[PDB]
Amino acid sequence: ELKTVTLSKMKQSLGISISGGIESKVQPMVKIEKIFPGGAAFLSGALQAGFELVAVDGENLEQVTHQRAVDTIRRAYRNKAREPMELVVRVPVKAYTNFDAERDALNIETAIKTKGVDEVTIVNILTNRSNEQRQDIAFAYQRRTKKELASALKSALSGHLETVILGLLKTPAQYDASELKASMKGLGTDEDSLIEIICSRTNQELQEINRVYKEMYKTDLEKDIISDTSGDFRKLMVALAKGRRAEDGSVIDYELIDQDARDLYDAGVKRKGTDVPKWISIMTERSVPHLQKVFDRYKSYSPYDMLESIRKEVKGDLENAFLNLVQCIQNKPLYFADRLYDSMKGKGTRDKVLIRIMVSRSEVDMLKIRSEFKRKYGKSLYYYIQQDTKGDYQKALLYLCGGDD
């Protein structure tokens, strides 16, 4: 009966109403009365009306006043510094049922077939459902129309909104695999996009990308990278894309931290030229927490930190890849906050980058991205998206952002 539910606090509203409290004889226990679409609770697909609230972010909800529960849950949900939110609940079926998926699909079909196309409703639904719920909706849509939802929306939408919506319909591994394929299409390479995905995805993400890429395209991802890249840049991309980094250990290896830092220095700043294979092996094989400590210890040996050392030692695609990788290791939400700022800061918008980050990180670490963004740039990610984009496309991105800061 007792269950701990983790919920992101990225959405502007939790999206629930509650009932009960010890000042009430009809309902001494606080329970959920209604779950609303558009809020965090609905997205979890793990909370139903009738569940007995026990604890939220460690604070107690059992045998409290109705106002105590209201204010305690509100205070927890507004405390963005603790992500995710932990909701301990007591049960007396899925929260998002076959009927919910069928209703969403029915409403999307209505919106597609409305004269002029009702894009507001399409955005309102799809950017406020989890990726898993979107797969359920696509399944229900095909069952009722005998047409694929992605194909129907490709025909009904256009412009940047079309790009957002079709991206949201793919599973995370499908989306990444299709963006990797796209980065390698045509004459030459979108190195920035290949580097962004390959440098930021974890072992578990890359395992699934490698599998799904082979299924979609009938060739291994590694073989397409080898075909499209060369030199040390190829060696680094191939290495990272294997998704075989050491897992985070429970023991900090201080001796190896120091030896790796010394080896990175000896390989680069200390010598004429660079021993690039040494850099590749250390930065692809060691766990991320280990490398965070290596890069701090590196500053004891080197007059320049790791990012400045890369700029001094290497150039071109290889330099771009190492700079992205080291940011991803040091602070991945800040890496994405900086890429979002760069996509909007100047004339027009690098919509390709803005869209991909909002689609791919919406359900991963968007609140931490937002926190780093607001701390560094002073106004919110929401604010920048509002100034740089317009229309239903803007509204879709703002829903993926989740809320203002």
């Binding site: 939790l14 109403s17 509650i18 409290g21 009430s24 009365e33 949900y77």
Partner: peptide, 6 residues
Amino acid sequence: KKITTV
């Protein structure tokens, strides 16, 4: 009895 949208 008391219902409150959080």
